[PDB]
Amino acid sequence: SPVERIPDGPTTPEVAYQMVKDETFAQTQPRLNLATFVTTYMDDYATKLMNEAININYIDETEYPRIAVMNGKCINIVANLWNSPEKDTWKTGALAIGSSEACMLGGVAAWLRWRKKRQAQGKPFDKPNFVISTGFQVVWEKFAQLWQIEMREVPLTLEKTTLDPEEALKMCDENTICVVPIQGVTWTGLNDDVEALDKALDAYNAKTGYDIPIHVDAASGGFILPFLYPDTKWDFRLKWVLSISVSGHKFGLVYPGLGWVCWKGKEYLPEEMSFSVNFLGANITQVGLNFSRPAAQILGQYYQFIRLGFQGYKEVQYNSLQIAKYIHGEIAKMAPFVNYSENVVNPLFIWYLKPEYAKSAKWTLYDLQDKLSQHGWMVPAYTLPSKLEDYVVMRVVVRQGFSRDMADMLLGDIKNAIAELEKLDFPTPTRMAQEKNLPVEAKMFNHGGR
Amino acid sequence: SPVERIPDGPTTPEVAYQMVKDETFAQTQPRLNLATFVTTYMDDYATKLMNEAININYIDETEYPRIAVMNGKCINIVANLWNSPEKDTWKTGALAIGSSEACMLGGVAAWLRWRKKRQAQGKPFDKPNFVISTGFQVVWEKFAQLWQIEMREVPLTLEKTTLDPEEALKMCDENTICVVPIQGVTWTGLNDDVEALDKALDAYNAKTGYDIPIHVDAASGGFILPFLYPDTKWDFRLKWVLSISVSGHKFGLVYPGLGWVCWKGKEYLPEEMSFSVITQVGLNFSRPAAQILGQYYQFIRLGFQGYKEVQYNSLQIAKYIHGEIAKMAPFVNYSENVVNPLFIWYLKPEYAKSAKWTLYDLQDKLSQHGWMVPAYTLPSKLEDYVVMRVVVRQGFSRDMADMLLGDIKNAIAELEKLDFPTPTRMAQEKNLPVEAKMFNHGGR
Amino acid sequence: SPVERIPDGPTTPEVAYQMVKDETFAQTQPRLNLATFVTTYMDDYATKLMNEAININYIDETEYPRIAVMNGKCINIVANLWNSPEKDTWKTGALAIGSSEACMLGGVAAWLRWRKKRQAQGKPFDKPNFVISTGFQVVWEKFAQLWQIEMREVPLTLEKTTLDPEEALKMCDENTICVVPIQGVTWTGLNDDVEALDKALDAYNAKTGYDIPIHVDAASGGFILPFLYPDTKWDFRLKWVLSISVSGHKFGLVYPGLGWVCWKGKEYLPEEMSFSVANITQVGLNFSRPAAQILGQYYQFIRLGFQGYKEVQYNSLQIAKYIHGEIAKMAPFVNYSENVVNPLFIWYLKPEYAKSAKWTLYDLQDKLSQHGWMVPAYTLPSKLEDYVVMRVVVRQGFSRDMADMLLGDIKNAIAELEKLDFPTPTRMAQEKNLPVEAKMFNHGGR
Amino acid sequence: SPVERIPDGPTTPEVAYQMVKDETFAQTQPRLNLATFVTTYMDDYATKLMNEAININYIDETEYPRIAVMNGKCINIVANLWNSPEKDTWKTGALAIGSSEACMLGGVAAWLRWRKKRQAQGKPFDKPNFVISTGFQVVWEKFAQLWQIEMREVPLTLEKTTLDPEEALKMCDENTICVVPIQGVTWTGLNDDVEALDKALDAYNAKTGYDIPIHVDAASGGFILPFLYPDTKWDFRLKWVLSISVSGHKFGLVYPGLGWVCWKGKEYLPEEMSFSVNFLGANITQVGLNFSRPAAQILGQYYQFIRLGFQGYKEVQYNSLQIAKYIHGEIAKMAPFVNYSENVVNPLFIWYLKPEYAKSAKWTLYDLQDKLSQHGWMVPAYTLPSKLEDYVVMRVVVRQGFSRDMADMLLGDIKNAIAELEKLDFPTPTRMAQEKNLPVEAKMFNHGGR
Ligand SMILES: *Cc1c(COP(=O)(O)O)cnc(C)c1O
Ligand SMILES: *Cc1c(COP(=O)(O)O)cnc(C)c1O
Ligand SMILES: *Cc1c(COP(=O)(O)O)cnc(C)c1O
Ligand SMILES: *Cc1c(COP(=O)(O)O)cnc(C)c1O
C-alpha cells in the first residue's frame, strides 16, 4: 500500500477497491457518535439524487443552467427564513462548502466595507480587527491568520456564559470591522444574545460614528431558530445584522459539503467580490472562493426544502430538541453533575462536575469519556475557553435519528459508569493530573478545531 | 417548485425526487461537451467507493483516523511526482476543493513569506503585488480582490505566445510576492516555460536581493508533465519553485471536488498557516471525503504506467485533431506543439478577410449537432483573435474525433455557400464585441 | 470498431460494453425533444417489471399461459374503451409492434373482405384502392407498395384542414376497400371528422351498394378521445367503422414496442387471418417477439385506471393549449387551427410577416437546437406544400415550468432573428423557389 | 383483477406491480424447457445494456443517429458472414422483429421481382405461387394468406427426409416466384440441401427462362453454418440464392426481438420497398414492416459480435452442437428409439419409436412427454408433416447454458421413464388413440405454429 510514491504499474480494480476499503471503515459505530454536528443520514431518494449527481460540475452554466437557478432559489429560501428585507426576488447570498468558507466570505465583506469607509474619511486602514467570544470555532482563527486581521476575544465567565454586549464594546474602536455573535457556540451550545448586542451597538455607533456591523455565525442555530423560535429577533430584522452564515450539513440535514452565507441586501456585498449573470430570467450572482465543486449538495438541500417544508423541518428539529432537553434534565438529577445552562436552545448542551463533588471525587469527566468509549459511544470531554479553562465539560449533540430509546440507552450507560467510578479506591491518572495542575490532552474530536 | 420561500408543508419523497430531477438534467449531451476540463467518468469500483463515502466527514479524525493518513499519503505521492527534495517521509501539502483554493493557499503563503522578509528588513509591506500572464484563470483575480493584492499582467503576443521571462522581470520590484507561470493555460493550452523563468529570476534575485519566488499554477499540466515529459524541468527541481498547485478533478481523473497544493519544504509554509498532529492546512473544515478515496484508488489502480497510458491516449487524439485542423483551408493553429490535451486554432488572416463567417458561426453550427466547442477572443494584445478550443478528456475515442472532424467539414461546406455575411462577421468589421455565451472555464 | 466484418477474436465484456455504450448515447437531451410522439418514461415499478421480462418470449403459450390471457384482457379493455358492441367477453383484436403493423392488419383485413364480396358478386378484384388524406403517415405508403394497392389521396387546403368527406367520396368506386380517417394527423395534430364521414358514407353506400367501410388510424388519438372527449362519436359507435388501430407507445404511456388493432366483431376479421384457441385469436405478422410491452400496458391500466389516464392526458392537453395560446399572441405566428384536440399542434408565419422577414421557421429550429431543443419544421402535404410549419408535441412529464422555458427561448430567438441584416440561406431558398431538405425527424416517414 | 373493462380509479404502484407479477410467472422451470429455440440468457453487461436502452426508439435518427449506423454495420457483418459478393461497403439488408418479418420481406421482394418480369414479357402475373417443404414454419402460411399467394408443398418421406430438388421442380411453372429451402427445419432439425437445389434450378432455368430464385429461410442455421461448416456452400456463393433470413434471438444469442434479412445485392431489392439515406458516410437503406420499435435488440446483437467475435461464436455453437450430438448418440443406444437422421448439423434433433418396438409397446412418445413433465421438463412430442403424419417424434433443442451435467440429468430421467413405462400392465390412452386413429391434441408448444 503506497505510502510515499505512486506504484509503478497498475493493480486490478477489485484488489484496489478492497485496499481502499480497508482504510476507510469507521473506527466506531457512527450512530453512537455524539461528538459530531454533521449530518450522516438522508433518505433513499435524496441519496440516490446526490449519488447520480457525483459527476455534475456546478460551475458549468452552459451544461447545467437550471442547477445555477436552483442554487439561487435555495439562497432565496434561506434568506427569507432569516427575514431578509431585500426587495429583489433573487436574494444576495453564496453557496459554500461549509460554514468555514461562508464565515470567511462574511468576514472579507465586512473588512472591505470597513476599508471603503475609512478611505472615504481619510483615516488609516492598515490595522483592522474584529471582536468575538473566546468560544469561537477555529475558522475565525484561520480568518485572522490568512487575512492578517487582529482577533479580539471576549472571555467567558460563570456570570457571562455567552458574549456580553457591554464587554464586547470595550474592545471596539475605529479599526473594528465587525462583531461576531455565535448561534450555537460549538463549545457550549448556547446562543449569543444578538438582539442585546444590536441594542448596544446602535447606541455605541451613534456616539462614535464607527458604524460597526454584526456578522452572525449561525453554523448550528441558523437552521434551528427560524423553526422553533420564530419570535426571537436574531436575524435580518435587526438593524446592524448585515450578514449571516450557516452549515447546511449540520442541521440543514444534508451530507457534508454545504454552507450558506446571506447578506441583508445587495449593497452590503462589495463589488470586488461578485460577478452577476442573467441565466434564464433569474439574477445569479457569483460569489465564493471555489470554482469547480460538486453540485450534489445543492440538489440535497433543495430536495429537503421541498420534501420537508416548514412544518417538516419544524418537526425534525423539535424532536431533536425534546430528546436533548430530556437528557439535559436527567443529567441534572444525578449527584455529580451540574448543567452549564438551564435552557436548551440548540440540540446540544454541556455539563460539568459540581465543584464540591470534583474536590473529593477520584475521577474526572475524562474517565467518564473513557468508560463510554468502552461501550462504543463517542462523548467528548474538554476544557472550556478562556477564564473557564479550569472547567472540564462533557457535550452531547442530538442529531436526527437519535431516538428516545437510544437516549435511555445512553443514560443507562452513564449511570453504570458513575457506579464504577464512584467505587474507585484511588484517583485516576487524569484526576491526579488536575491535582498537579498538568494539562490533559483532549484526544477526542469535538469540532472546536483547537 | 418553490422560488422565493420554503413550502409550508411536506410532500411525499417520490414527488420531491421528480421535482428536483426535472431541474438537474444536462442541457446537452455531456459526451459531446468539448468545453470542459473536469472529469466526468470513473469506473464502477471508484464510483461505488465514492458513493458509499457520501456521509463521511473528512475532518473527524477520531471516527476516521486512517482517512487523514490516506490524505497525507496522497500528498506524498503528488509531491514525489513533482520531485520534491524534502527529506521527511511526510511531505508538506494540502487537500483542496480545487485548483482555486490550492492557488490561493500558494498565494497567501507567498504573501506571508514576503511580509516576513520586509518586516525583518524594515521595509514597507502594505502594497504587495504579483506577476502573472494575461492568460490567467479567474481564481487569480479573486485572489487579487479578496486579499487586496495588486495583479501585474504580462500580455500575450504572436511572438511571445506564453509568459515571457524578460517581460515578466520588467514588472517585478521590492513589493512582488511571487511570479506565477501556468502549466496548461486555459485559453491556449500551452505551458509557460518555468525553467527559463527560473534562470532569469536567479540572475534578477542575485542583482536585487528581492528573493522573488515562483508558484506554478499547474491545474491541467500538473498531472500531465510527470508522466509524458519527465525530463522537462518545471517542478521542485528548480531553485525558485517553492509551491505547485493542481486540479485533481481534471486530469487526475477524479470526480469534481479535488485539488492539491505542495510546497518545496516545511520551511516555505509559514507558521501562521499550519499546525501538525500530518499538517492541517486549508480554507475548509468539514468537507466531503469521497474525493480523497477516489484519488487514492486511482493511484493504486493505475499506477505510473496506468496514468501514463491514459494521458498518452488523450494527447495522441489531441495531436490527431490538431493535425487534421491544420490541413483545412480556413484554419491555422496557435502553436505547432500540443503538450496538453487541448489546443486552439483560428481563421487564417487571408481567409478571414474574404470569408462571410467567423468561428462563432462554426460554434453555432456544431451546437446544432449537439457539440459544445467554445469560441472566444484571446487575452490582452491578442483580443482581436477569435479562437476555438478543443479539450480531449479520457473516454473521447478516435471514432468520436472523426465524428467531430466530419461535422466540422460539413459545417465549413455550409458556411462557404453563404450568400451574405453572418451577424458576427458584420460585428467584426464594425469592431463591436460579441458575447462569448459558452462556458470556456476561463471564468471572466 | 467493426464496420464491415465480425472481429476474429473475442474482447473482454467490459471493453465491449464501453464500445457499444460509445455509440448509443442520445445526440441531444431527450427531455427537450419536442419532435417525437413516443413515450420515454415509465415509473420505476413498470420499468422493473419490463426489464425483468426481457427474456420472456410472448409466443410460448405453454411456458407463459397467463401472459397470453393478459394480452387478451388488454384487447378487451381497449375494445371497450372504443365502445365495441361485440357481445362475447373476449373481444377481437391483435397485439402489434406499433401502429405500423396494426394499420397493415386493418388494411389487409379490409382488402380480404373486399375480395370476398367481389368474388361472390362476379365483379373483378384485381385493381384495389383505398382513400386517405395526404396527411398520411409513411406506413400507408408501405401498405400501398407491399400489397400493390393504389393509394388515392385527398388534399389539404386552408378551407379543408382535415379530410373532407365530400371530396373523399369523389375518389371512391367499386374498387375502394375502405376510407382511412386519421385521429391525430402526424403533420397537423387534428382529427379527421369520422362522424361526418360515416354520415356521408351511409348515404353513399345505400346509393351504390359498394359497402365501403372505415378503418380509423388513431395512432395518437386512440388513447386521447375516450378519456377527454367521451361524447365524440368516432369509434365503434358508428355503423361503418369496422376496425381501429392505435400506438400503445405514444399516448398509451408504454415504452416502445406496442400497438393495438381491434375489430367491431369477429365477423369482420376474415377467416384467412385468424386462428382461435379463455378465447385467444392468433392474428399478426410476427411470431416470436418481446412480451415486456404487454406487461407494461396492463400495469398502466391497473395503476392509472380511467381517471388516472384522464388526468395524464388532461395535463398534456392543458400544457398544449397553453403553449398554443402564447404562440398565437406573438406577432410573427398564426396557428393552423383554433382548437387543440391532441397534445400537439402546428403554427406558421403570418403571410404578411413572412413576405418581408429575413428568416424562416427553419432558422427558428436552428436557434432552438443551439439551446438543446428539438422542435421540427417542415412543409405541409399536398396543396399546402408552400407552408413551412413548426410542431410541438407535449408528452407526459413536460411541465408548466419547461413550457415557459421553451416560450422564453422562442421569444429570445425571434428577437435575434429580427436583427438580421440579410436573408438566411433558407429564406433565400424560398425566394429562389427551391425546396429545403427537411433534416429533423418529424415522425412523418417521408 | 380486470378482465373486461378498465378500472375506474387508480391503485398504488406497489399493488399494481404485484397484480401484474402474479400473472407473469412461468408455468414451469424455464431452464428445463427443451422445446424453445429462443435465447433466454445474455451476460450481465448485455442485459444492463439492453435494459438501459428500453426507452430508445430506434426510428428517431436525429436523436440516435449512430444507432442507425450501428444497424447498418450489423447488416454488413451478417451479409459478410453469408459471403455476399456485393462490392459496396454498406450491404443490402433489413432489421426485423424476427424471422417472421424477415421471411415475409424476402417473399415480398421475390413476388415484386416476379411481377416485374411478367409485365415486361406480356405474360399474366395474377396467380403467383411459391414452392416449399411441408416442414415449413407457420410464417410461410401467413405469407400465403396475407398476400394471397399459392403455397405448393413438397412432402417429406423416409427416403426424402428433406426438400428433394427434383420433386420441388415438378411443382414449378411460369407463376413460381421462388423456392424456399430451410436451414434448420423446425420439425426435424435438418438442413435442406441448398447447393443441390441451385444445381437443379440452374439447369431448369436455362431450359425454361423462368429465372426462379432461392430465398433461404435460415432461422436457426443462419448463425450455425458460417461458424461450424464454413465450406458448406449454402449462401450467397450460389448463383440463385438472392435473399436469406435468420432469427437473431435463436442462435444469434440475443433476447427476443431480432431478425435479419439480406439480399445478394441492391438490384435484387425492388425500388418500391426501400428508401435510402446517407448519414456519417453510410448508405442507410430503410426497409421493413415496422416504424417505431425497440432498439435494445440492435445493441445486444452488436455487443455479441464484438464480445464474442468469430471464434467466440464458433465456440458457443460448438458446445451446443457437441451436447446435442452427445444426447443424440445416447438416445440411439436405447432399445425403444431410432433417430430420424444419423447427422446432427443444428443443435436440435428428433427421434421416434422403432417400428418393431412400437407395434407391441403399451406406450407412445406422448407418454414419455408426460413422464418428463412430471419431473418439470418440457420435451415436446408431435407428429411430422405430410406423408410422415403417422410418425410421432420427440425433439430436443440445446441452447447455450445447457451443460453436460444437465444432459445426463435429462438422460437419467428418460431411462427411468422407460423403465416405468415398460412395467405397464395396460396400454395408455394415447397408445389406444394410435390404434383407433383418433387425433391427440399436441398441447405443448413446439414452435412450428401449425
Ligand atoms: C483549469 C484551471 C483551474 C481550475 O480551478 P478549479 O477550482 O479546479 O475549477 C485553475 N487555474 C487555472 C489557471 C486553470 O487553468
Ligand atoms: C460548527 C461551526 C462551524 C462549521 O464549519 P464547517 O466548515 O461547516 O465545518 C463554523 N463556525 C462555528 C462557530 C461553528 O460552531
Ligand atoms: C424458428 C423459425 C422461425 C422463427 O420465427 P420468429 O419470428 O423468429 O419467431 C421462422 N421460420 C422458420 C422456418 C423457423 O424454423
Ligand atoms: C404515429 C403514427 C403511426 C405510428 O406507427 P408506429 O409503428 O407505432 O411507429 C402510424 N400511423 C400514423 C398515421 C401515425 O400518425
Q: What is the DSSP string of B49-63?
A: HHHHTTT-BTT-TTT
Please state, in angstroms and rounded to a whole number, the distance separating the CA atoms of residues D94 and D72: 8
**Ligand 3 pocket member D182 (CB < 6 A):** yes
Please state, in angstroms and rounded to a whole number, the distance separating the CA atoms of residues C375 and D168: 56
With a CB cutoff of 8 Å and minimum separation 6, the contacts of B32 are B370, B371, B372, C27
- Experimental method of this PDB entry: X-ray
**Per-window interface: A 235-294 vs C, CB < 8 A:** 280-281
C-beta separation of B258 from B249 below 8 A: yes
- Top mutation candidate among B137, B217, B254 for ligand 1, by most atoms within 8 Å of CB: B137
Interface touch D6/C40, C-beta < 8 Å: no
**Per-window interface: C 114-173 vs D, CB < 8 A:** 115, 126, 137-139, 142, 145-148
Grid cell digits, residue D235: 449462401
Nearest to C78 by CA among C308, C252, C232: C252
**Ligand 3 pocket member D186 (CB < 6 A):** yes
Ligand 1 nearest atom to the CA of residue B37, by list position? 1
Grid cell digits, residue B370: 449537439
Sheet order of strands, D214-217 included: D93-96, D259-263, D241-247, D214-217, D176-180, D129-133, D150-154
Range list of H helices, C123-174: 139-146, 165-169
CA C206 to chain centre: 32
Domains assigned to chain D: 52-307 (3.40.640.10), 308-436 (3.90.1150.160)
DSSP C404-444: HHHHHHHHHHHHHHTT-SS--HHHHHHHTT------S--SS
> Is B370 at the interface with chain D, CB within 8 A?
no
With a CB cutoff of 8 Å and minimum separation 6, the contacts of D356 are none
CA B345 to chain centre: 19
Please state, in angstroms and rounded to a whole number, the distance separating the CA atoms of residues A192 and A182: 5
Ligand 3 nearest atom to the CA of residue D37, by list position? 1
**Ligand 4 pocket member C103 (CB < 6 A):** yes
Interface touch A54/B255, C-beta < 8 Å: yes
Cβ count near A238 (within 10 Å): 20
DSSP B192-261: --HHHHHHHHHHHHHHH-----EEEE-TTGGGTHHHH-TTS--STTSTTEEEEEEETTTTS---SS-EEE
Nearest to C284 by CA among D7, D142, A110: D142
Nearest to A36 by CA among D106, B402, D439, B57: B57
Local structure of residue A223 (DSSP, 8 states) = G
The three-class DSSP label of residue D401 is coil
- Residue from the list C370, C399, C422 with its beta carbon closest to the beta carbon of B368: C370
Q: Which residues of chain C lie closer than 8 angstroms to A73, CB-CB?
A: none
The shortest C-alpha distance from C371 to chain D (Å) reads 15
Q: Report CA(D319)–ligand 3 centroid distance (Å).
A: 22
Interface touch B25/C29, C-beta < 8 Å: yes
State the Cα angle at D148 between D142 and D152, rounded to 5°: 75
The shortest C-alpha distance from B372 to chain A (Å) reads 9
Resolution number, Å: 2.6
Helix C400-417 to helix C292-328 angle (10° resolution) is 50
Instruction: Compare all CA atoms of chain C with the CA of B29 and give the residue at the minimum distance.
Output: C28
Q: Report CA(B219)–ligand 1 centroid distance (Å).
A: 5
Instruction: Compare all CA atoms of chain A with the CA of C29 and give the residue at the minimum distance.
Output: A63
Local structure of residue C57 (DSSP, 8 states) = B
Cβ count near C89 (within 10 Å): 11
CA A217 to chain centre: 7
Taking 3-state DSSP, the helix, strand and coil percentages for chain D, each rounded to the nearest 5, stand at: 40, 15, 45
Local structure of residue A91 (DSSP, 8 states) = -
Q: Which residue has the cell 477489485?
A: A14
Q: Report CA(D222)–ligand 3 centroid distance (Å).
A: 11
Residue C356 is assigned to a ligand binding site: no
Instruction: Compare all CA atoms of chain B with the CA of A17 and give the residue at the minimum distance.
Output: B45
Long-range contacts at D113-116 (CB < 8 A, ≥ 24 apart): D113/D177, D113/D213, D113/D268, D113/D270, D114/D176, D114/D177, D114/D178, D115/C148, D116/D270
C-beta separation of A276 from A134 below 8 A: no
- Ligand 3, atom 1, lies closest to the CA of D219
With a CB cutoff of 8 Å and minimum separation 6, the contacts of D118 are D124, D125, D174
List ligand 2's pocket residues with C-beta within 6 A: A 37, 98-100, 103, 137, 139, 182, 184, 186, 217, 219-220, 247, 259, 447; B 284-286
Q: Which residues of chain C lie closer than 8 angstroms to B368, CB-CB?
A: 366, 369-370
Instruction: Compare all CA atoms of chain C with the CA of B364 and give the residue at the minimum distance.
Output: C370
Enumerate the β-bridge partners of residue C397. Answer: none
Please state, in angstroms and rounded to a whole number, the distance separating the CA atoms of residues D281 and B264: 55
- Ligand 1, atom 1, lies closest to the CA of B219
Residue C247 is assigned to a ligand binding site: yes
- Which subunits count as partners of chain B given 3+ CB pairs below 8 Å? A, C, D
Please state, in angstroms and rounded to a whole number, the distance separating the CA atoms of residues B64 and B286: 13
**Per-window interface: B 14-73 vs A, CB < 8 A:** 14, 16-17, 19-21, 23-24, 26-28, 30, 33, 35-36, 38-41, 43-51, 53-67, 69-70, 73
> Is B436 at the interface with chain A, CB within 8 A?
no
Interface touch B403/D280, C-beta < 8 Å: yes
> Is C408 at the interface with chain A, CB within 8 A?
yes
- Which subunits count as partners of chain D given 3+ CB pairs below 8 Å? B, C
Ligand nearest to the CA of D188: 3
Q: Report CA(A108)–ligand 1 centroid distance (Å).
A: 22
Range list of H helices, D96-188: 99-121, 139-146, 165-169
C-beta separation of B212 from B205 below 8 A: yes
The three-class DSSP label of residue A112 is helix
- Ligand 2, atom 13, lies closest to the CA of A137
**Ligand 4 pocket member C259 (CB < 6 A):** yes
Range list of H helices, D185-263: 194-208, 225-228
Q: Which residues of chain D lie closer than 8 angstroms to B406, CB-CB?
A: 280-281
Please state, in angstroms and rounded to a whole number, the distance separating the CA atoms of residues A317 and A221: 10
Please state, in angstroms and rounded to a whole number, the distance separating the CA atoms of residues B118 and C250: 75
Q: Which residues of chain D lie closer than 8 angstroms to C33, CB-CB?
A: 60, 63
State the Cα angle at D232 between D230 and D234, rounded to 5°: 110
Locate the DSSP E strands across D345-421: 348-353, 381-383, 392-397
Burial class (CB in 10 A: 0-12, 13-18, 19+), B41: middle
Instruction: Compare all CA atoms of chain D with the CA of B370 and give the residue at the minimum distance.
Output: D63
How many secondary structure helices (H) and strands (E) does chain C include?
13, 11
Phi, psi of D287 (to 5 degrees): -125, 150
Answer whether D touches C (≥3 Cβ pairs < 8 Å). Answer: yes
Q: Report CA(D313)–ligand 3 centroid distance (Å).
A: 20
With a CB cutoff of 8 Å and minimum separation 6, the contacts of A283 are A72, A88, A89, A90, A276
The shortest C-alpha distance from D66 to chain B (Å) reads 10
With a CB cutoff of 8 Å and minimum separation 6, the contacts of A209 are none
**Amino acid letter, residue D245:** S
Between the CA of residue D287 and those of A274, B68, C95, C445, D73, what are the distances in Å?
Answer: 59, 62, 22, 12, 15
State the Cα angle at D381 between D378 and D386, rounded to 5°: 145
Range list of H helices, D333-388: 355-360, 365-374
Q: Which residues of chain C lie closer than 8 angstroms to B45, CB-CB?
A: none
- Ligand 3, atom 9, lies closest to the CA of C288
Between the CA of residue A349 and those of A134, A185, A395, what are the distances in Å?
Answer: 17, 10, 6
Please state, in angstroms and rounded to a whole number, the distance separating the CA atoms of residues C193 and C221: 12
Residue C220 is assigned to a ligand binding site: no
C-beta separation of C394 from C319 below 8 A: yes
C-beta separation of B66 from A93 below 8 A: no
C-beta separation of A249 from A98 below 8 A: yes
Interface touch B301/A16, C-beta < 8 Å: yes
Instruction: Compare all CA atoms of chain C with the CA of B425 and give the residue at the minimum distance.
Output: C421
Enumerate the β-bridge partners of residue A215. Answer: A243
Please state, in angstroms and rounded to a whole number, the distance separating the CA atoms of residues B22 and B17: 9
C-beta separation of B282 from B254 below 8 A: no
Grid cell digits, residue C287: 411470431
Altogether, the residues listed in chain B come to a count of 444
As a whole number of angstroms, the longest Cα–Cα distance in chain D is: 74
